[PDB]
Structures are given as structure tokens and as C-alpha cells.
Specification:
This is part of a larger assembly, with two copies of chain A.
Chain A lengths: L15 E3 L27 E2 L3 E5 L2 E2 L6 E3 L2 E2 L2 E2 L2 E2 L2 E3 L7 E2 L4 E5 L5 E2 L11 E3 L4 E5 L2 E2 L8 E2 L2 E7 L5 E11 L16 E3 L14 H7 L2 E4 L4 E5 L7 E8 L2 E6 L11 E5 L8 E5 L1 E3 L8 E2 L2 E7 L2 E6 L5 E6 L7
Parallel strand pairs in A: 1-9, 6-26, 13-27, 19-26
Antiparallel strand pairs in A: 3-29, 4-28, 5-28, 7-8, 10-25, 11-22, 11-28, 12-13, 14-17, 14-25, 15-16, 17-18, 18-20, 18-21, 22-23, 23-24, 29-30
Chain lengths: 328, 49
Amino acid sequence: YVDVGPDSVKSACIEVDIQQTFFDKTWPRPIDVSKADGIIYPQGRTYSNITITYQGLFPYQGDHGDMYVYSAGHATGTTPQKLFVANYSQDVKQFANGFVVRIGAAANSTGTVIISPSTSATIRKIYPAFMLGSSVGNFSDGKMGRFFNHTLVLLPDGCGTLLRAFYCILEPRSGNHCPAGNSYTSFATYHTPATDCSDGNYNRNASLNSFKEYFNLRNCTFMYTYNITEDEILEWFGITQTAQGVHLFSSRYVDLYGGNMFQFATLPVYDTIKYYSIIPHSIRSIQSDRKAWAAFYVYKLQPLTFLLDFSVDGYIRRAIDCGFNDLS
Amino acid sequence: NDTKIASQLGNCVEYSLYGVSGRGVFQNCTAVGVRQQRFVYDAYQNLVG
């Protein structure tokens, strides 16, 4: 099997307090289809400035999306305290023929800390983590979303510059505040900026090790990694599945400014995905050094058709959802 | 030990490009986007370049 490295020594975990009422916010973001927002570029072909009709999977034009916000854990003084996170681990979703997301949408602006929102800290881009698989069921403590067999994991590690993918299995731990333990609340992962992300040595395993503290990886069959560099300019990302297996898309590799998605990578796994969830995460930074994080959005794909206004440089610049209204 | 047929410029000699095939004349023209999608097409799916 894949060399993920050693099993973490402790079976123990940091307690996860659910603070979900702090995360209720209202910042809807409808798709601006006339800016080609959320448009996945067609596969294997390109076009001139000619307008063409098209059929493919797309987000619904009027959908304002699902919004999630990552936050720092509790800390006081100069040290870490028990985690404070949203109840997003319980948000099981049926897979719906893939999805797309927006990252960094609130970047280069200010907002609030959310978990301790009175601080009114400026907000910055943060990269999301996710899990996918063919089945879900109850955790031994009756919590929602435990997964069966093998699941996909997409985890940024350490700083946003490193990304890893996995296709193995997970095993529960009997330590305090962990899945086989009966002191368990909910699953979470974390990053600790005090030692993680050193400027001359970013911690490539930081997020992975905190993942390992709640679950023992077992029987891993796939791992992949990628290189990213920081950019507060908005990025698009998404996942689809075909009979050729799961595919990964991003706007970052080709079209940093127009935002058109392209298939940056693909995955060997063709096992059908029936469920999807977002992995909760938290920052272990000192409370006075805490920073607010930018809003994050998710939209679901549908077999829609569109006009596409290609640019002479082939970026799609405008589009029309045919079914949105009678004018369209 | 071959004629180096990766390009001609040009007349009308049949071609194969990564399993895409047809017959035609090639010429060294300017670039259009999107670069590195390889195959440029019109609305009737004729390969343009």
C-alpha cells in the first residue's frame, strides 16, 4: 500500500466544541452567467470569437449557493485552547453529478472573525478540505456522516501551496475526543501556524498529521500531490465523475483572471460516488494573532444548455442559461 | 532513417494528429486562443487549425 508515513502515536484528540450558531451569516452569491461565472471550459477543443450553443453540466444560474466559513479554534492569552467549530461534519450531501466552488471570493476586503466576530479582523483566502464516497451511516455515538469502505480525500496541507489527494480507508480511534471513544463530539482537523508553515520550511504534513490524530489510515491505495502558489485573486475549483473516473478542475492553471475552469488533473478511481461532505478545519493560532477568513461557496451541477460567447483568446466571456427565463 | 514528416507547408496531404484525422493543407499562421487546447474548431466542427 501507499507510504502515507507512520501512524500518529496518540490515539487522543483535541476536543471539538460545536459553536455552529456563530456561523450563521447571510452572504448569498448568485451566479453571474454573463461574466461566465462557474463555466467549465469544453473538453479537448477550442473556439474563435464565434458564439456557439453548448450542452454540459453546469450550476443553476439563479443558485446563490451554499456558504461555509472556516475559523480559528479557541485560544486565550498566548496559547491554544479547545476547538470552536461549525457543525459542518454533519452536512451529508447526496452526490449530484459533481460540483463547483468559489475560493477567495471575499479576499482583499474586511469582515469579522465569526467565532469571535467582535474583533472585526480583515478576511483572507483559505483553502477548503473535502471527502467523497459511496456510502454513509451513523458514527458509533449516533453522529451523522460516518463513511464506509474507501473514500476520496482532498486536503490542502500546511499552507495553501501544497495539495494532496487520497483514495484509501479510515479507521476510528479510541482516544479521548475521537471516533471510537465515547467522549467524541465531532470530527475536525487543524493547523497550527506557530510551528506549521515556517517561512523557510512550510510544513508539508501539517494538515495530514492532524487528520491522522482522529483516524488511522488503513489500506491506502492512492495518493497524489500538487504544487500551488498563493494568490488572493479568486479561484474556481470543482469535481466531476465519468465512467473514466473522477476528474479535477480549476481555473488557476490557465485562466487566473477570467475564471474559466479547466481540467487540471484526473483521478484513477471510478467507484461511484454517492455522497459528499466538507471537512471542517480550524486554526490553532494565538487569539491576539487570530485572523478572519474569507467566505467559501459551493454550487451543484445540472445537464443545462447555454449560449457561449467565446473570446478571440477562447476564454468564455459571456453565457446564457436557456431555461432561466423566457428572455433567456 | 526517415523523411521527417512532422510538418509540411504545404499542399494537401492526409494527416493524423493524436488519432484525429483528415486531409488538408497546413500553413504557418498566427495564434488564436485557447493555447494548448490543440484543436481549434468552427461552429460546424470543421477543424480550423
